[PDB]
Amino acid sequence: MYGLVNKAIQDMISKHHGEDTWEAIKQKAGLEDIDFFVGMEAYSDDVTYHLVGAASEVLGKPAEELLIAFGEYWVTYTSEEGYGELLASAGDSLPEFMENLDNLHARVGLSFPQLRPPAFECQHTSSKSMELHYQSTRAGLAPMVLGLLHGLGKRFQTKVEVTQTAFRETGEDHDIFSIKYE
Amino acid sequence: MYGLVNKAIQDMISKHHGEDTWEAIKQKAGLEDIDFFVGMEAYSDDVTYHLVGAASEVLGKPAEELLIAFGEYWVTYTSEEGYGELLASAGDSLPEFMENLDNLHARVGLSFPQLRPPAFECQHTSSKSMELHYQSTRAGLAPMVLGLLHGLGKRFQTKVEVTQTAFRETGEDHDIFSIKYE
Amino acid sequence: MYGLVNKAIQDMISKHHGEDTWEAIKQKAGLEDIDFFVGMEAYSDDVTYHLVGAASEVLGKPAEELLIAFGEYWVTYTSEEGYGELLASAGDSLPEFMENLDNLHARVGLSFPQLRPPAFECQHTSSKSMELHYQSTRAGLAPMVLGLLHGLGKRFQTKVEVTQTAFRETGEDHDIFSIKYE
Amino acid sequence: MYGLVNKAIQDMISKHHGEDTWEAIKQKAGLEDIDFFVGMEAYSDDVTYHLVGAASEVLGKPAEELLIAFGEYWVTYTSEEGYGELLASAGDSLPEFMENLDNLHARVGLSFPQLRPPAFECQHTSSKSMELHYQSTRAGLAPMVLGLLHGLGKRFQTKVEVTQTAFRETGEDHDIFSIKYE
Amino acid sequence: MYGLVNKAIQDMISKHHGEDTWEAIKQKAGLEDIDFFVGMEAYSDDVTYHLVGAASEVLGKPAEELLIAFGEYWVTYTSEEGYGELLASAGDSLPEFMENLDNLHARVGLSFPQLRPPAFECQHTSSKSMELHYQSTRAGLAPMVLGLLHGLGKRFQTKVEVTQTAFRETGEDHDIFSIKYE
Amino acid sequence: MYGLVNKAIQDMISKHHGEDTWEAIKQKAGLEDIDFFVGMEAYSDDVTYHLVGAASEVLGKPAEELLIAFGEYWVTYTSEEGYGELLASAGDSLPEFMENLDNLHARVGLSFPQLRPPAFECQHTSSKSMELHYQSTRAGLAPMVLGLLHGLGKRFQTKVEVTQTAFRETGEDHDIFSIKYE
Ligand code: HEM
Ligand code: HEM
Ligand code: HEM
Ligand code: HEM
Ligand code: HEM
Ligand code: HEM
């Protein structure tokens, strides 16, 4: 993934746990060489999976829980580190934002040539609920999606209950979530 | 037009008149189905013309006057809902901004693939006046242009006197305006 | 419009009437300064209108009649002068091509930054007809659209009868054409 | 997927089995409403899957076997229907072409705003082999990738033996193919 | 260069020296005709070199020193006149920002079609130093680069010692700088 | 530079001198590691310079003389290897083509994200001459520009005499060529 993703992980870990901790995860993940992540450069995805794996081992939390915290954090990180207006433009409520998410990432991708964005399709089941289809070239990120959705609930002051009902990891076509909001 | 246009109309009407009023216009325009406008999605232009037509009937104001208020509002709405830096970059005075307006919309259009922007050509007649040519794929929006120009005068603390001297609605090639400023 | 349009007019007139006629037309249009048109450079629309009025004068043909000739010509010109794959990609039947026309001009628009390309909306009224809405920032080019549709007919080996039912020139919102096709 | 993919299936099936068979397949897929596919318009992925399942049913062939046929076909189709220079530009040998494949789809992606194109990573294990990582937002298209590689073999006049070693469908992170080539 | 560059020069001179002074430089540079620079329009580069030359003569400072002040100012000007989020996104420290600078300008260039950005390559010689290669289509701007680097040191609260060790002006391939930081 | 440039050199040398000579050159350049060039991948400029110095050594020809040969070759190569329509689109005469050259590279630059393409400015000094300003982030490629102009002469069936009057290498701001053409 692009370096910004790995910077955001470093940032969350640094700020929640301090540098020493960050350095220990970084060392563990096999990454002590790298002096700093370059935000607009492409990195092999293993970099990210190794960080989360190392953070899990070093912090004594499951991987899923780090990916959940990271997803939530990302909503704050993008808004504060150069993408605040882009976020704002993608809408004003949870239901709208999720409909715009493919278009948001298409705009990201204008600037990040090599982006491999997720794809999100909403089927609204009521004015307060939907079924969300999450399609990705990557494996293993559903818990980051749950995190992101809660981050978005906070951003819109909207309570969000989310349950995953299909699992790309067991060989289903893709992840699917039922969501109720406000 | 893109959904953001219709959100901005909903916003202006909601904030100036309350929700109930907004809902009544929305119902009248034939649009009660739509739970929310999706900002980065393309809508049929009739959506917008129907809203203005319904707002006219429900508020008891002429259509032109709504389109005038809307034009002015739009200068505030874009600056506050995700396009504040883009607006800033298009310049620092009325004369400059209008020269940049085609380039501004070309930048908008990078992100809105399907954009059909207006085209604006300035002929400066003095360092305090110009003749503005407004060319559009759409009919009926000259009063939104007058609105926008006054919104831009406010933004630059510049007094703006604008008169329309050619009328695309009577079959002239396009709308033209004489403008004096400061 | 971009210089490719002006080159096409020069080429058409030259081919059909010889160079002496072309030079006369160019001179009458007030354009003898211009040594050659630069294909990817933007020109004032006025350049094209002057060429067409001057050609009308010099040839004894109405301008509208020349614009029909020019519209058919453009389909061949574009296919032979650098856009043949782009054209092929837009479809292999009349109705399909007309549906892809905005997307064709969007692809043109990636290469011509300053493009102001017409917008075309199809309402298919059966498998052998459609209503075509032509929306344009410019005036006076509906007869070219008639010639283009005929060029496309020949391209597909499809007979097509085009009849205009609404006229921008007279103050209607946009040109609308009723199209029967085999 | 974009309509060009669906056109290609229709063309392949038509060419190989005639129109009556094609119309039967299209009808069985629940698509008799659709008068023709619009090449540059986005369709629900479901349209393509339904066509392939309906073709499998109507022809007595497994869907996977049709997707291989379709993958080989696409290499010829794209080269003949508007993408021949683009294809040529991506290389003049199998390994080179496979290395340029993301960059080829990035160029496709400039023209198809909403493209969701596969990601392909090569690990060259010698001058006569590589391991190919196929990563996709979509399920079920690994057999098409097998057919495409064979089409590319013919394009280069290179024999190629493709054997899949990892399977998304069964829950593995992504499809991985082992490729020997002359 | 694009008009924004010349606006930024006018701004720095105006704010540091007042308008009268600005007007005198502007007059001297042969530019009194131009009522205002259009930020997103392309200008001949001589415009910029003439301004700096005139400012040098009128202010009684060497050209290099103006270009140094301008470079530093530019880091503030972009951050405040519409590019603050873009700047933020290009990173969080001197070493990272300089690695992202080509990507930053590639993003600028999406919006400025005709941009001729510099190219910057970093060779890191320690976690506190590098060798920076500055490649440009233009001559004469090395002192603006030194200015920019100090502006970036301020932005990141990082002390920066920079020495130029190759000179494109004497016919070396390009400018090179040794840099130590913090 | 992007791998297409290196492929072109390999192709030229191979075609003209056979493979054994090519392999010798590649080995002498220190590049025997590289199994093949990837057309759409960016390479360090050094790769190209090393190939040219190594070819000069192995063939007994000055590097400048090879770069002329390479410049003529590129006009044919690009027209035959995927860019023939793009080339055709840039004009049908020498002067027109030279005026469109920046716009041609802008279109190339949409496909090659990281392109650093030369800038070319024409001052037409009559209908049979121009002064050509070649501005480049890179050193040493003026003799290639001489070969390209000759390739373009042949393309148009236009004799052309190119004589360089200003030299970057010696410290002048940029290369300037005086061009007479039939
Ligand atoms: C303006 C804010 C955002 C920016 C700048 C941004 C940008 C990015 C970037 C650069 C990547 C890495 C993909 C790659 O390197 O190829 C990414 C991945 C991802 N994004 Fe966003 N994005 C933003 C908002 C969000 C939000 C709010 C969501 C929540 C729904 C989201 C969902 C995801 C997911 C789930 C991934 C993981 C990659 C995958 O699934 O394949 N994005 N995005
Ligand atoms: C950064 C601020 C702006 C943004 C994001 C923006 C974006 C838009 C969008 C999305 C549309 C709808 C067109 C379509 O959907 O195809 C539009 C239309 C329009 N814009 Fe802007 N624009 C902005 C600034 C302005 C300003 C300040 C003016 C005032 C001169 C202006 C003049 C217009 C007009 C008159 C239309 C009506 C459509 C037509 O004439 O065909 N724009 N713009
Ligand atoms: C690959 C083929 C084509 C290319 C490269 C091309 C490119 C262009 C260009 C450069 C313009 C000038 C617009 C401007 O300068 O702002 C133009 C205008 C135009 N195009 Fe196309 N185009 C193509 C095919 C067609 C076809 C087949 C049609 C038929 C419907 C068409 C309809 C028009 C019309 C009516 C205009 C006039 C401008 C206007 O109405 O405002 N185009 N196109
Ligand atoms: C110039 C040639 C090509 C063009 C114009 C083309 C264009 C496209 C398009 C439009 C899609 C549909 C994606 C979407 O709608 O979101 C697609 C998908 C696909 N392409 Fe290509 N492509 C080309 C060559 C190839 C080749 C040679 C391969 C062989 C490796 C390939 C691999 C695939 C695969 C496997 C997909 C399936 C979608 C997926 O896996 O998610 N493409 N491409
Ligand atoms: C978001 C902030 C920035 C923006 C909007 C911006 C944009 C620009 C623009 C429009 C030009 C004129 C080039 C042309 O007109 O063709 C330029 C030139 C230049 N930029 Fe930036 N840039 C920014 C940041 C910087 C920074 C921080 C540096 C410092 C390393 C930098 C280094 C340069 C240099 C040295 C030039 C001179 C032109 C040349 O060398 O050929 N840029 N940039
Ligand atoms: C369709 C035809 C062409 C294509 C696809 C093409 C593409 C390219 C590419 C990829 C580069 C490498 C730049 C980089 O990697 O950053 C390049 C450089 C170059 N191009 Fe072109 N180009 C074409 C035609 C021409 C022509 C006819 C000329 C003749 C004036 C020309 C002048 C040059 C020069 C002098 C460079 C050397 C790089 C430099 O000077 O910095 N190009 N072009």
PDB file of C-alpha atoms in Angstrom, chain D residues 10-182:
ATOM      1  CA  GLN D  10     -21.775 -11.716 -27.219  1.00  0.00           C
ATOM      2  CA  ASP D  11     -19.400 -11.445 -30.122  1.00  0.00           C
ATOM      3  CA  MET D  12     -17.502 -14.596 -29.195  1.00  0.00           C
ATOM      4  CA  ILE D  13     -20.680 -16.649 -28.716  1.00  0.00           C
ATOM      5  CA  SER D  14     -22.310 -15.251 -31.852  1.00  0.00           C
ATOM      6  CA  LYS D  15     -19.301 -15.800 -34.006  1.00  0.00           C
ATOM      7  CA  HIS D  16     -18.811 -19.384 -32.739  1.00  0.00           C
ATOM      8  CA  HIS D  17     -22.417 -20.538 -32.334  1.00  0.00           C
ATOM      9  CA  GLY D  18     -24.539 -18.134 -34.405  1.00  0.00           C
ATOM     10  CA  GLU D  19     -27.153 -15.565 -33.391  1.00  0.00           C
ATOM     11  CA  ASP D  20     -29.989 -17.915 -32.475  1.00  0.00           C
ATOM     12  CA  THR D  21     -27.754 -19.453 -29.760  1.00  0.00           C
ATOM     13  CA  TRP D  22     -26.692 -16.005 -28.600  1.00  0.00           C
ATOM     14  CA  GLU D  23     -30.329 -14.835 -28.292  1.00  0.00           C
ATOM     15  CA  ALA D  24     -31.242 -17.991 -26.388  1.00  0.00           C
ATOM     16  CA  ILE D  25     -28.319 -17.347 -23.950  1.00  0.00           C
ATOM     17  CA  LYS D  26     -29.201 -13.712 -23.504  1.00  0.00           C
ATOM     18  CA  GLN D  27     -32.828 -14.635 -22.841  1.00  0.00           C
ATOM     19  CA  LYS D  28     -31.922 -17.380 -20.339  1.00  0.00           C
ATOM     20  CA  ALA D  29     -29.696 -14.858 -18.528  1.00  0.00           C
ATOM     21  CA  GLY D  30     -32.727 -12.552 -18.043  1.00  0.00           C
ATOM     22  CA  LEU D  31     -31.331  -9.870 -20.310  1.00  0.00           C
ATOM     23  CA  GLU D  32     -33.678  -9.738 -23.222  1.00  0.00           C
ATOM     24  CA  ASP D  33     -34.607  -6.216 -22.066  1.00  0.00           C
ATOM     25  CA  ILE D  34     -31.080  -5.018 -22.988  1.00  0.00           C
ATOM     26  CA  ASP D  35     -31.212  -4.162 -26.693  1.00  0.00           C
ATOM     27  CA  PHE D  36     -27.439  -3.935 -27.108  1.00  0.00           C
ATOM     28  CA  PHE D  37     -24.467  -3.433 -24.744  1.00  0.00           C
ATOM     29  CA  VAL D  38     -23.014   0.106 -24.601  1.00  0.00           C
ATOM     30  CA  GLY D  39     -19.237  -0.376 -24.719  1.00  0.00           C
ATOM     31  CA  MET D  40     -18.222   2.529 -22.420  1.00  0.00           C
ATOM     32  CA  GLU D  41     -21.077   2.199 -19.925  1.00  0.00           C
ATOM     33  CA  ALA D  42     -20.628   0.407 -16.612  1.00  0.00           C
ATOM     34  CA  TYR D  43     -22.824  -2.623 -15.952  1.00  0.00           C
ATOM     35  CA  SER D  44     -23.477  -4.611 -12.805  1.00  0.00           C
ATOM     36  CA  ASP D  45     -21.009  -7.483 -12.647  1.00  0.00           C
ATOM     37  CA  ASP D  46     -24.039  -9.743 -12.323  1.00  0.00           C
ATOM     38  CA  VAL D  47     -24.792  -9.112 -15.983  1.00  0.00           C
ATOM     39  CA  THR D  48     -21.548 -10.847 -16.985  1.00  0.00           C
ATOM     40  CA  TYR D  49     -21.922 -13.747 -14.496  1.00  0.00           C
ATOM     41  CA  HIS D  50     -25.492 -14.394 -15.673  1.00  0.00           C
ATOM     42  CA  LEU D  51     -24.353 -14.431 -19.270  1.00  0.00           C
ATOM     43  CA  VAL D  52     -21.627 -16.978 -18.496  1.00  0.00           C
ATOM     44  CA  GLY D  53     -23.937 -19.257 -16.387  1.00  0.00           C
ATOM     45  CA  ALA D  54     -26.619 -19.029 -19.048  1.00  0.00           C
ATOM     46  CA  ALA D  55     -24.126 -19.828 -21.788  1.00  0.00           C
ATOM     47  CA  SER D  56     -22.857 -22.822 -19.735  1.00  0.00           C
ATOM     48  CA  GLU D  57     -26.462 -24.102 -19.415  1.00  0.00           C
ATOM     49  CA  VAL D  58     -27.337 -23.539 -23.100  1.00  0.00           C
ATOM     50  CA  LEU D  59     -24.050 -24.905 -24.514  1.00  0.00           C
ATOM     51  CA  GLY D  60     -23.478 -27.935 -22.129  1.00  0.00           C
ATOM     52  CA  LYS D  61     -19.986 -26.625 -21.160  1.00  0.00           C
ATOM     53  CA  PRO D  62     -18.755 -25.746 -17.720  1.00  0.00           C
ATOM     54  CA  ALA D  63     -18.636 -21.970 -17.007  1.00  0.00           C
ATOM     55  CA  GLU D  64     -14.868 -22.304 -16.261  1.00  0.00           C
ATOM     56  CA  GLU D  65     -14.325 -23.764 -19.662  1.00  0.00           C
ATOM     57  CA  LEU D  66     -16.151 -20.846 -21.317  1.00  0.00           C
ATOM     58  CA  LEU D  67     -14.083 -18.330 -19.298  1.00  0.00           C
ATOM     59  CA  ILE D  68     -10.872 -19.896 -20.691  1.00  0.00           C
ATOM     60  CA  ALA D  69     -12.323 -19.514 -24.183  1.00  0.00           C
ATOM     61  CA  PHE D  70     -13.326 -15.965 -23.367  1.00  0.00           C
ATOM     62  CA  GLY D  71      -9.837 -15.054 -22.016  1.00  0.00           C
ATOM     63  CA  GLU D  72      -8.139 -16.179 -25.271  1.00  0.00           C
ATOM     64  CA  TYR D  73     -10.803 -14.418 -27.268  1.00  0.00           C
ATOM     65  CA  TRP D  74     -10.278 -11.082 -25.434  1.00  0.00           C
ATOM     66  CA  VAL D  75      -6.673 -10.775 -26.599  1.00  0.00           C
ATOM     67  CA  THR D  76      -7.865 -10.922 -30.232  1.00  0.00           C
ATOM     68  CA  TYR D  77     -11.001  -8.847 -29.598  1.00  0.00           C
ATOM     69  CA  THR D  78      -9.231  -5.983 -27.905  1.00  0.00           C
ATOM     70  CA  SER D  79      -6.567  -5.898 -30.604  1.00  0.00           C
ATOM     71  CA  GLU D  80      -9.210  -5.652 -33.368  1.00  0.00           C
ATOM     72  CA  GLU D  81     -11.840  -3.409 -31.748  1.00  0.00           C
ATOM     73  CA  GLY D  82     -10.026  -0.226 -30.806  1.00  0.00           C
ATOM     74  CA  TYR D  83      -7.154  -1.174 -28.505  1.00  0.00           C
ATOM     75  CA  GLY D  84      -4.581  -2.556 -30.961  1.00  0.00           C
ATOM     76  CA  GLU D  85      -1.985   0.184 -30.457  1.00  0.00           C
ATOM     77  CA  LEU D  86      -2.501   0.142 -26.670  1.00  0.00           C
ATOM     78  CA  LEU D  87      -1.912  -3.623 -26.721  1.00  0.00           C
ATOM     79  CA  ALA D  88       1.194  -3.344 -28.942  1.00  0.00           C
ATOM     80  CA  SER D  89       2.584  -0.692 -26.601  1.00  0.00           C
ATOM     81  CA  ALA D  90       2.497  -3.115 -23.640  1.00  0.00           C
ATOM     82  CA  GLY D  91       5.325  -5.170 -24.978  1.00  0.00           C
ATOM     83  CA  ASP D  92       6.697  -7.615 -27.427  1.00  0.00           C
ATOM     84  CA  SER D  93       7.227 -10.682 -25.321  1.00  0.00           C
ATOM     85  CA  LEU D  94       5.210 -12.611 -22.762  1.00  0.00           C
ATOM     86  CA  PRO D  95       7.245 -11.694 -19.660  1.00  0.00           C
ATOM     87  CA  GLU D  96       7.448  -7.992 -20.644  1.00  0.00           C
ATOM     88  CA  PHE D  97       3.746  -7.831 -21.348  1.00  0.00           C
ATOM     89  CA  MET D  98       2.899  -9.450 -17.974  1.00  0.00           C
ATOM     90  CA  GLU D  99       5.169  -6.868 -16.225  1.00  0.00           C
ATOM     91  CA  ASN D 100       3.385  -3.962 -18.003  1.00  0.00           C
ATOM     92  CA  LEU D 101      -0.122  -5.305 -17.277  1.00  0.00           C
ATOM     93  CA  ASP D 102      -0.891  -2.954 -14.372  1.00  0.00           C
ATOM     94  CA  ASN D 103       0.385  -0.036 -16.411  1.00  0.00           C
ATOM     95  CA  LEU D 104      -1.735  -1.134 -19.359  1.00  0.00           C
ATOM     96  CA  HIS D 105      -4.857  -1.181 -17.156  1.00  0.00           C
ATOM     97  CA  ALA D 106      -3.831   2.230 -15.664  1.00  0.00           C
ATOM     98  CA  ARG D 107      -3.940   3.614 -19.235  1.00  0.00           C
ATOM     99  CA  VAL D 108      -7.309   1.831 -19.786  1.00  0.00           C
ATOM    100  CA  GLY D 109      -8.354   3.423 -16.466  1.00  0.00           C
ATOM    101  CA  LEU D 110      -7.794   6.963 -17.690  1.00  0.00           C
ATOM    102  CA  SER D 111     -10.507   6.254 -20.301  1.00  0.00           C
ATOM    103  CA  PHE D 112     -12.827   4.120 -18.109  1.00  0.00           C
ATOM    104  CA  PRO D 113     -13.213   6.333 -14.960  1.00  0.00           C
ATOM    105  CA  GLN D 114     -14.942   3.561 -13.066  1.00  0.00           C
ATOM    106  CA  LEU D 115     -12.551   0.692 -14.069  1.00  0.00           C
ATOM    107  CA  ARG D 116     -11.880  -1.996 -11.433  1.00  0.00           C
ATOM    108  CA  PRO D 117      -9.006  -3.773 -13.184  1.00  0.00           C
ATOM    109  CA  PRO D 118      -7.157  -6.776 -11.844  1.00  0.00           C
ATOM    110  CA  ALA D 119      -3.677  -6.349 -10.309  1.00  0.00           C
ATOM    111  CA  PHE D 120      -0.873  -8.599 -11.602  1.00  0.00           C
ATOM    112  CA  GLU D 121       2.483  -9.107  -9.937  1.00  0.00           C
ATOM    113  CA  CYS D 122       5.336 -11.108 -11.557  1.00  0.00           C
ATOM    114  CA  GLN D 123       8.086 -12.917  -9.723  1.00  0.00           C
ATOM    115  CA  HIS D 124      10.439 -14.103 -12.496  1.00  0.00           C
ATOM    116  CA  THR D 125      11.866 -17.387 -11.282  1.00  0.00           C
ATOM    117  CA  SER D 126      14.149 -17.723 -14.319  1.00  0.00           C
ATOM    118  CA  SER D 127      14.358 -16.518 -17.925  1.00  0.00           C
ATOM    119  CA  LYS D 128      11.830 -19.268 -18.816  1.00  0.00           C
ATOM    120  CA  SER D 129       9.405 -19.040 -15.848  1.00  0.00           C
ATOM    121  CA  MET D 130       7.593 -16.799 -13.429  1.00  0.00           C
ATOM    122  CA  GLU D 131       5.135 -16.897 -10.560  1.00  0.00           C
ATOM    123  CA  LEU D 132       2.084 -14.660 -11.414  1.00  0.00           C
ATOM    124  CA  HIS D 133       0.022 -13.193  -8.603  1.00  0.00           C
ATOM    125  CA  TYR D 134      -3.477 -12.303  -9.740  1.00  0.00           C
ATOM    126  CA  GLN D 135      -5.350 -10.013  -7.322  1.00  0.00           C
ATOM    127  CA  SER D 136      -8.896  -8.930  -8.081  1.00  0.00           C
ATOM    128  CA  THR D 137     -11.906  -7.228  -6.506  1.00  0.00           C
ATOM    129  CA  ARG D 138     -13.937  -9.980  -8.193  1.00  0.00           C
ATOM    130  CA  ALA D 139     -14.455 -13.689  -7.805  1.00  0.00           C
ATOM    131  CA  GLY D 140     -14.397 -16.490 -10.249  1.00  0.00           C
ATOM    132  CA  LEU D 141     -12.231 -15.061 -13.084  1.00  0.00           C
ATOM    133  CA  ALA D 142      -9.082 -17.070 -12.628  1.00  0.00           C
ATOM    134  CA  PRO D 143      -9.997 -19.310 -15.561  1.00  0.00           C
ATOM    135  CA  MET D 144     -10.261 -16.274 -17.800  1.00  0.00           C
ATOM    136  CA  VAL D 145      -6.716 -15.343 -16.732  1.00  0.00           C
ATOM    137  CA  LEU D 146      -5.595 -18.805 -17.879  1.00  0.00           C
ATOM    138  CA  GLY D 147      -7.181 -18.207 -21.332  1.00  0.00           C
ATOM    139  CA  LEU D 148      -5.640 -14.707 -21.582  1.00  0.00           C
ATOM    140  CA  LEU D 149      -2.188 -16.054 -20.929  1.00  0.00           C
ATOM    141  CA  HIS D 150      -2.711 -18.525 -23.717  1.00  0.00           C
ATOM    142  CA  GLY D 151      -3.889 -15.795 -26.079  1.00  0.00           C
ATOM    143  CA  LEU D 152      -0.740 -13.868 -25.174  1.00  0.00           C
ATOM    144  CA  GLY D 153       1.342 -16.965 -25.925  1.00  0.00           C
ATOM    145  CA  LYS D 154      -0.112 -17.046 -29.448  1.00  0.00           C
ATOM    146  CA  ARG D 155       0.361 -13.317 -29.795  1.00  0.00           C
ATOM    147  CA  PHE D 156       4.115 -13.649 -29.108  1.00  0.00           C
ATOM    148  CA  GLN D 157       4.431 -17.082 -30.743  1.00  0.00           C
ATOM    149  CA  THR D 158       5.473 -18.402 -27.413  1.00  0.00           C
ATOM    150  CA  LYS D 159       4.374 -21.691 -25.953  1.00  0.00           C
ATOM    151  CA  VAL D 160       3.322 -21.336 -22.381  1.00  0.00           C
ATOM    152  CA  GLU D 161       2.244 -23.782 -19.704  1.00  0.00           C
ATOM    153  CA  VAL D 162       0.127 -22.190 -16.984  1.00  0.00           C
ATOM    154  CA  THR D 163      -0.670 -24.089 -13.819  1.00  0.00           C
ATOM    155  CA  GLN D 164      -2.627 -22.513 -10.901  1.00  0.00           C
ATOM    156  CA  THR D 165      -1.053 -23.188  -7.514  1.00  0.00           C
ATOM    157  CA  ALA D 166      -3.198 -21.061  -5.165  1.00  0.00           C
ATOM    158  CA  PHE D 167      -6.956 -20.500  -5.283  1.00  0.00           C
ATOM    159  CA  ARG D 168      -8.920 -17.482  -4.003  1.00  0.00           C
ATOM    160  CA  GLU D 169     -12.126 -19.530  -4.258  1.00  0.00           C
ATOM    161  CA  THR D 170     -11.045 -21.864  -1.567  1.00  0.00           C
ATOM    162  CA  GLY D 171     -10.164 -18.984   0.767  1.00  0.00           C
ATOM    163  CA  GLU D 172      -6.508 -18.342  -0.160  1.00  0.00           C
ATOM    164  CA  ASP D 173      -5.550 -14.675  -0.195  1.00  0.00           C
ATOM    165  CA  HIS D 174      -5.247 -14.595  -4.023  1.00  0.00           C
ATOM    166  CA  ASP D 175      -4.770 -16.737  -7.126  1.00  0.00           C
ATOM    167  CA  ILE D 176      -1.152 -17.578  -7.914  1.00  0.00           C
ATOM    168  CA  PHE D 177      -0.111 -19.208 -11.224  1.00  0.00           C
ATOM    169  CA  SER D 178       3.146 -20.910 -12.043  1.00  0.00           C
ATOM    170  CA  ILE D 179       4.113 -20.223 -15.650  1.00  0.00           C
ATOM    171  CA  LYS D 180       6.687 -21.954 -17.877  1.00  0.00           C
ATOM    172  CA  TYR D 181       7.289 -20.362 -21.239  1.00  0.00           C
ATOM    173  CA  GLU D 182       9.626 -20.841 -24.205  1.00  0.00           C
TER     174      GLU D 182
END
